Design a protein around this nucleic acid. Structure first.
Ligand SMILES: [Mg+2]
Ligand SMILES: [Mg+2]
Ligand SMILES: [Mg+2]
Ligand SMILES: [Mg+2]
Ligand SMILES: [Mg+2]
Ligand SMILES: [Mg+2]
Ligand SMILES: [Mg+2]
Ligand SMILES: [Mg+2]
Ligand SMILES: [Mg+2]
Ligand SMILES: [Mg+2]
Ligand SMILES: [Mg+2]
Ligand SMILES: [Mg+2]
Ligand SMILES: [Mg+2]
Ligand SMILES: [Mg+2]
Ligand SMILES: [Mg+2]
Ligand SMILES: [Mg+2]
Ligand SMILES: [Mg+2]
Ligand SMILES: [Mg+2]
Ligand SMILES: [Mg+2]
Ligand SMILES: [Mg+2]
Ligand SMILES: [Mg+2]
Ligand SMILES: [Mg+2]
Ligand SMILES: [Mg+2]
Ligand SMILES: [Mg+2]
Lengths: 48, 106, 46, 377
RNA sequence: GAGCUACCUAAAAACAAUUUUAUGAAUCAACUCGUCUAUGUGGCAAAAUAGUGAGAAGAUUUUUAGGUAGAGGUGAAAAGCCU
RNA sequence: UCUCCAGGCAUACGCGUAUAACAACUCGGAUAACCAUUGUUAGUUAAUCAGAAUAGGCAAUAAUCACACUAUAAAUUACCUAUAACUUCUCUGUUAACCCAACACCGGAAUGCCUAAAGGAAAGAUCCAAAAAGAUAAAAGGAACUCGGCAAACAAGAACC
């Protein structure tokens, strides 16, 4: 999720869970030629 | 005492710490081993000369290799030359070599 | 010699000489920012 | 009796025909160079941007790409076609595993993240050295051979062409350059060439894969740096041929991580790609030490074999080099192709409990023994 | 305001070939400089071009980052330099 | 395809979409073709290239192929002792004919490799007037030119204040 605070994690802390996700992505047609397995996406800049 | 310690008095200090007496030269028993022509390896000089050349020049893609590389290379290469004698003397399979091992005593 | 090219760009030099952190280091530099904020400048510092 | 002038293109004109005529001019200076150093110097002195090929690579399906860059057909199995106390070898190899994992006492490294790959290096280093001294009496060649530890093998070649897409050079035709830089964990070099695995001009129905996209789409990146052709030693070294290479796969590519990433089908693919790239460079570099290049293709097939291990599992590969004519010009009418033979990975042992190795498999050891037993004819 | 320039600090670079020797030596490139003449003079250029020249292992040249600020700084003193 | 010319390819710094395709033909290129212009759409993919635990103890012996060899300007975290942790790949740079000089400026611009296999085009068409600029040749003479051998030369040697 973006524009939200992630709880600071220290040794032994819980897992970080996002129940509702603010990330929205779109599948785009490649500009150049890509292998048949490869797929292109446009994703928010804060997504890893 | 560790590897990078350099004794100011050299051998004299080392002898005192270890309570040992120094005799110049190797033991006569060891010397006579290679004096026998039977121990002489085939193409001994030519192979050794190649080992020196390989360690100094031919092993790397660089023009002039550095000591941090050829100094280990020469010794291991020489040991392999001395290890070929398993063709003549068996029972040299009853030994093995390890690398970078720790010794210590008090 | 030909003049006019006294500017040899360098981002490290620029941000060190005229940057936000540099301006706030001394009280006179803080007043540089205060003037520009009062004037309404879109760029307070490099 | 009319001496008509030869119908050839001009040397100095600005055309494609006149450029291909200035290409044969320098290419002829290689043909006419007496020494092999001059030939390799001429062929590599001019640096241009080239794809860097990594034998150990995390890219998907890199094995197929390396076949295309190399013109190699991959055949599953081994190439078509003396008891020496296997138990004695079994004891010695078992001792090596126990010695490093248990008995040896060293200063442990500063990074937890490197303690495992250092264990694998020491055992595979010991195993290779011991198997080279117990098998030496049976195979005298190993006695005079050279054993290299982490020495560099380099091959640089041209294959294919493209149109430069942008800039002042848009539309120009440029070759696709590749270079392989490799540091095999261990390798054995002999001064006499091994026998072939199949006759030159051997023909098989299999077809080398054809890649629609550029090498870039597979993560593969270009750089411009010194072009080098190296076999493990310089041309002056008498030991100018290759017997076997031993490769240790990095932890990043080992079985558990790949399965986690969901690329389970790539576990074997990692082994294949390393062999094709590692052996193609090494067999190719030997050929150019003998004076053979793209315009003087090899007369003798060049052979080498390698064993690839991830520290526990072992796989064995054999390579035969038939073609150095890979460029668009020199590959115009080439029926030859290069061949690589490989097998699935098999465990050599399972675990060490107490001071005994558990699960040791003799079958894999024989394959290592057979590879180390091959000799020149 | 020292991204130019003057000087400095720290960390880095470059110097082929030839002869002397053992070098702020010689011939001469790269590189640095700018002697003499012509062109140019709102010019290609708010100081250049083309030739010709001086140095070219050193008090050499170059790169990067830092320092010294106007009642001042820097100066192998030209009252030079400090956009 | 031909004729001719001879600093090109990378990286650093810098620049910031000038990248590529299409469509346009107003503005921009000192003119056209065509686009470097306008609009629209695309693009640069990295565990290797590049960027971003604590406390003590202790160091005489350059470099130059480092041997010989002398020298003078005197010259580059390691290794140990204890403590602590006990399997990891995310993030960011990646296009181009590009930057500093008001300009698509004959200027300025570090390094590695190489010297033509890479990169380029001096002439829009015509005409051959003067004056002007540049290159080449010179009968006989050879500084008589000129403030002065300036400039040039099939010369570039010698000496003296
Ligand atoms: Mg200005
Ligand atoms: Mg500057
Ligand atoms: Mg400065
Ligand atoms: Mg020199
Ligand atoms: Mg001198
Ligand atoms: Mg001179
Ligand atoms: Mg002089
Ligand atoms: Mg001065
Ligand atoms: Mg005065
Ligand atoms: Mg001024
Ligand atoms: Mg374009
Ligand atoms: Mg158009
Ligand atoms: Mg456009
Ligand atoms: Mg790095
Ligand atoms: Mg680029
Ligand atoms: Mg203009
Ligand atoms: Mg060209
Ligand atoms: Mg023109
Ligand atoms: Mg004309
Ligand atoms: Mg003349
Ligand atoms: Mg005359
Ligand atoms: Mg007169
Ligand atoms: Mg007079
Ligand atoms: Mg004159």
């Amino acid at each position: 999720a973006r524009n939200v605070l992630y709880p600071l994690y220290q040794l032994g802390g819980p897992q970080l869970r996002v129940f509702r996700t603010n990330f929205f992505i779109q599948l785009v047609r490649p500009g150049t030629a890509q292998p048949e397995d490869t797929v292109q996406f446009r994703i928010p800049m804060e997504m890893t | 005492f560790h590897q990078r310690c350099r004794l100011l008095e050299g051998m004299k200090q080392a002898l005192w710490l270890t309570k040992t007496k120094l005799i110049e030269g190797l033991p006569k028993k060891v010397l006579s081993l290679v004096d026998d022509p039977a121990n002489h390896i085939e193409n001994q000089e030519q192979r050794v000369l190649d080992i020196i050349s390989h360690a100094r020049l031919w092993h790397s893609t660089e023009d002039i290799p550095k000591r941090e590389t050829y100094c280990p290379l020469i010794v291991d290469s020489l040991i392999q030359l001395c290890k070929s004698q398993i063709l003549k003397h068996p029972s040299l399979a009853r030994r093995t070599s390890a690398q970078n091992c720790t010794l210590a005593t008090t | 010699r030909a003049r006019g090219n006294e500017y040899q760009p360098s981002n490290i030099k620029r941000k060190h000489k005229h940057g936000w952190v540099r301006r706030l280091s001394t009280p006179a530099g803080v007043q540089v920012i205060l003037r520009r904020m009062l004037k309404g400048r879109k760029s307070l510092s490099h | 009796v009319a001496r008509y002038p030869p119908i050839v293109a001009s040397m100095t004109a600005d055309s494609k025909a006149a450029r291909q005529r200035r290409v044969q001019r320098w290419q002829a200076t290689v043909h006419a160079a007496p020494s092999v150093d001059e030939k390799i110097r001429i062929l590599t002195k001019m640096q241009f941007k080239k794809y860097v090929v990594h034998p150990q690579i995390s890219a998907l399906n890199a094995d197929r790409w390396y076949q295309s860059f190399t013109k190699t057909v991959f055949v599953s199995g081994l190439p078509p076609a003396p008891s020496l106390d296997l138990a004695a070898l079994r004891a010695a190899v078992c001792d090596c595993i126990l010695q490093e994992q248990v008995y040896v006492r060293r200063r442990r490294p500063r990074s937890l993240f490197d303690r495992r790959q250092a264990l694998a290096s020491s055992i595979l280093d010991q195993v290779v050295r011991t198997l080279v001294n117990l098998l030496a009496p049976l195979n005298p060649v190993l006695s005079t051979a050279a054993l290299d530890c982490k020495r560099s093998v380099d091959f640089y070649w041209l294959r294919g062409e493209e149109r430069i897409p942008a800039g002042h050079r848009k539309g120009h035709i440029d070759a696709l350059r590749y270079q392989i830089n490799d540091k095999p964990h261990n390798q054995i070099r002999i001064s006499k060439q091994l026998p072939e695995f199949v006759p030159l001009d051997y023909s098989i129905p299999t077809e080398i894969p054809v890649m629609k996209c550029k090498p870039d789409k597979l993560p593969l990146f270009r750089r411009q740096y010194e072009n080098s052709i190296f076999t493990g030693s310089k041309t002056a070294d008498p030991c100018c041929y290759g017997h076997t290479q031993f490769h240790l796969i990095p932890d990043r590519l080992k079985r558990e991580r790949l399965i986690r990433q969901n690329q389970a089908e790539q576990v074997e693919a990692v082994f294949r790609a390393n062999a094709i790239a590692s052996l193609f460079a090494w067999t190719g570099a030997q050929a150019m030490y003998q004076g053979f290049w793209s315009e003087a293709d090899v007369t003798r097939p060049f052979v080498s074999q390698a064993v690839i291990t991830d520290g526990k599992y072992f796989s064995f590969f054999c390579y035969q080099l038939n073609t150095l004519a890979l460029t668009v010009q020199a590959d115009q009418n080439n029926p030859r192709k290069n061949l690589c033979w490989g097998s699935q990975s098999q465990p050599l042992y399972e675990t060490v409990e107490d001071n005994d190795v558990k699960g040791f498999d003799d079958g894999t050891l024989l394959q290592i023994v057979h590879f180390l037993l091959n000799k020149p004819r």
